[PDB]
Structure 1
Amino acid sequence: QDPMDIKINGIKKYTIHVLAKVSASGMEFTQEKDFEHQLLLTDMLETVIRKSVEVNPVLHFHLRKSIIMNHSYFILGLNYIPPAFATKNVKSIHEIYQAIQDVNDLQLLDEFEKSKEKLINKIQQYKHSDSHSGSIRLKDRLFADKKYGSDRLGNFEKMNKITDNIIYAAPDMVNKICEGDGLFYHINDGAIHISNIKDFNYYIPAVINEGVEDIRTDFSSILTCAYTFEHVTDLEREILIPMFDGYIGKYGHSVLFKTLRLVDHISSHYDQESNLLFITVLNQLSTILTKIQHTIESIEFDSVSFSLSKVMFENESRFRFEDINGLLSHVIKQHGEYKNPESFLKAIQNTDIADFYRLKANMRWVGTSIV
């Protein structure tokens, strides 16, 4: 029996039910030496298990080794038709475990090459970006560890040298997925159920190289500036700073759009995993650099535009909650009362402009990458 039944009411009633398990790996994903091996075996397992489990009434089976705030987690997910609306009842969690343990090794070997090529392609496309690659190079130098940047989806050289003798580590992976301690999430009948109260302590990498300049020579330009914040609270990381990013580079007449329209393709994004706010803009970049810096240094706010950013960010959160997968991901990742979408929305509505000035005082520049 579960130790608790944390039922969150007031949830949108979906056409399907969801049963998820989140199993924690306390060690940081940078500390895991077999990171490329665990990723490949997990994808091989998911593909094989999916063929046996994704039958009626199960609509989708999910099994991934995911990173939540620089910590690895095994996340198993099951989307299924409710028994009242299904011709067949859904398997129990014990029967799902038994299917995972009944996976044949030849089935896994039959997926080895396809899963290896799949993950190899993800590593390349994640590193081979026109705009995101600048933020990847910054995170590599700012943190002095390529696991936070280029090797976030796995190192290419480590992943490409994997042979099919990885099959012998499959029992270790099956055991961790089935017997490792974890939390169960159950979405059904307009409610979210969590098996226990346990918030996994977040980890944010500290900047080791402060004031990074990526002087890079290449022919067709693009620039990317990185910023961080000190004394980041949960309210700032999950609400205030995402609001601040939309305020300055996303919500309509953003501060950067109006500022850079004087010169006359702007993008910004706050990375919660690294606590880094990036600003990417496509000779003329030299004036844009000083123009962006001075604008961020002399940033100001007002309550009317702040209230609009609260409304916009609430509706963006509401849109995520519309999707049952967006809702599940929110409840898994958030801490404490933020797991409740209503409490999360209420927290957005209760923000004030003094929060932005506290964030402005704790903001600083850490790096800049130009190609």
Structure 2
Amino acid sequence: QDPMDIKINGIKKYTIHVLAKVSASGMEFTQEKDFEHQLLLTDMLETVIRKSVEVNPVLHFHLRKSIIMNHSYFILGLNYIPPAFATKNVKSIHEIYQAIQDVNDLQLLDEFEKSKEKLINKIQQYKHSDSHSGSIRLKDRLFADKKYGSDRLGNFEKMNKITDNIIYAAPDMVNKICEGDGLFYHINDGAIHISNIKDFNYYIPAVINEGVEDIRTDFSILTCAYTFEHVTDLEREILIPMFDGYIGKYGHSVLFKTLRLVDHISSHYDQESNLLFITVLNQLSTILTKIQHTIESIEFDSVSFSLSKVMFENESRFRFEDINGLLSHVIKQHGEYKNPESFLKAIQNTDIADFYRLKANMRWVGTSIV
């Protein structure tokens, strides 16, 4: 029996129910030495298990080794038709475990090459993203560890050299998925249930190389990185994302208005690394000083702040519309932020004084130009 039944009421009523298990791999994902091995086996397992579990009433089966604030987690998910609306009842969590342990080793070998090529292509396409590559190269040098940037989806050389003898590590992975302690999430009847109170202690890498310049020579873009000190949960989850939309997203952003004087602008806050990036496509030399001076002399006002609160609430509401965005939110958020209503209320209760605390804790750390 579960130790608790944390029932969060007032949830949007979905056409399906969801049963998810989140198993903690406490060590930071860079400390895991078999990271590329664990990724490959997990996708192999997911593919084989999916063929056996994704039958009526199960509509979608999910099994991934995901990173949540620089910590590995096994996340098993089951989307299914509710029993009152299904011609067949759903298997229990025990029967799902039994299906995972009944996976045949030849079935895994049949998926080895396809899963390996799938993950290899994800590593390449994620590294081969120019606007993000500037953010990738910055995170590599800012943290002095390629696992936060290039090797975030796995190192290519390590992943490309995996042979099919990885099959012998499948029992270790099956054990970790089935027997490792974790939290159970259950979405049904306009409510989400959590099996226990537990907040995943976040980990944010510290910047080792401060003031990075990526002088890169290539023939036919810029990217600047900023961080924040003394980051609270309110800032990382609400205030800083609002600030990112304020300066480079919400319509007449501060950067679009600033750079239109010169006359293709993007910005994004990376919660995993606590880094706010700014990417803009000779003329880039004047834009560099123009962007720096704009962030240094950034100002706010309560009228436009109230609009950023409304916009960010609606963006959060749109994520809650998706049953997976709702589930991911309830998994990741701490304490009362798990409740979407509390999270939305926390957005509504922010004030402009919070932005001036954030501005005082903001600083530049890196720039990448190609």
Cα deviations by residue, 1:133-181 (Å, 9 ceiling, x for unpaired): 1000000000000000000000000000000000000000000000000
What SS does the aligned partner of 2:27 have? coil
Deviations 1:227-246 (A, max 9, x none): 00000000000000000000
Structure 1 residue 106: deviation in Å? 0.1
What is the distance in 1 between the residues matched to 2:256 and 2:26?
Answer: 42
User: Which whole-Å deviations, capped at 9, do the CAs of 1:324-345 have from their partners, x for residues lacking one?
Assistant: 0000000000000000000000
Displacement of 1:313: 0.1
- The CA deviation at 1:96 is 0.2
- 3-state SS, counterpart of residue 131 of structure 1: helix
Once the two structures are TM-superposed, the CA of residue 130 in structure 1 deviates from its matched residue by 2.1
Identity of aligned residues (%): 100
Distance 1:255 1:293 in 2: 12
Query: Secondary structure at 2:130's aligned position in 1?
Result: coil
Q: CA–CA distance in 1 between the matches of 2:235 and 2:346?
A: 11
CA RMSD of aligned residues (A): 0.4
**Distance in 2 separating the partners of 1:26 and 1:53:** 28
SS at match of 2:50: helix
Which residue number in structure 1 is paired with residue 238 of structure 2? 239
Measured against aligned partners, the alpha-carbon deviations of 1:107-151 in whole angstroms (never above 9, x if no partner) come to 000000000000000000000012111000000000000000000
Distance 2:317 2:294 in 1: 31
TM-superposed deviation, 1:84:
0.1
What is the TM-score when the length of structure 1 is the normalising length? 1.00
> How far does the alpha carbon of each residue in 1:169-226 deviate from its partner, in whole angstroms, 9 at most, with x for none?
000000000000000000000000000001010000000000000000000x700000
Alpha-carbon displacement from aligned partner over 1:288-328 (angstroms, at most 9, x marks no partner)? 00000000000000000000000000000000000000000
Stretches of structure 2 that go unaligned for 5 or more consecutive residues are: none
Q: What is the TM-score normalised by the length of structure 2? A: 1.00
Instruction: Provide the aligned length of Structure 1 versus Structure 2.
Output: 370
Residue matched to 2:354: 355
Query: Could you tell me how far apart the structure 1 residues matched to 2:125 and 2:322 are?
Result: 26
Secondary structure of the structure 2 residue equivalent to 1:343: helix
Partner secondary structure for residue 151 of structure 1: helix
C-alpha distance in 2, partners of 1:254/1:10? 34
Task: Report the Cα distance in structure 2 between the residues aligned to 1:200 and 1:181, rounded to whole angstroms.
Answer: 13
SS at match of 2:175: helix
For residues 323 and 198 of structure 1, the distance between their equivalents in structure 2, rounded to whole angstroms, comes to: 24
| Structure 2 Cα separation of the partners of residues 43 and 265 of structure 1 | 36
State the partner residue of 1:39: 39
Which residues of structure 1 form unaligned runs of 5+?
Answer: none
Deviation string 1:44-90 (CA, Å, 9 cap, x unpaired) is: 00000000000000000000000000000000000000000000000
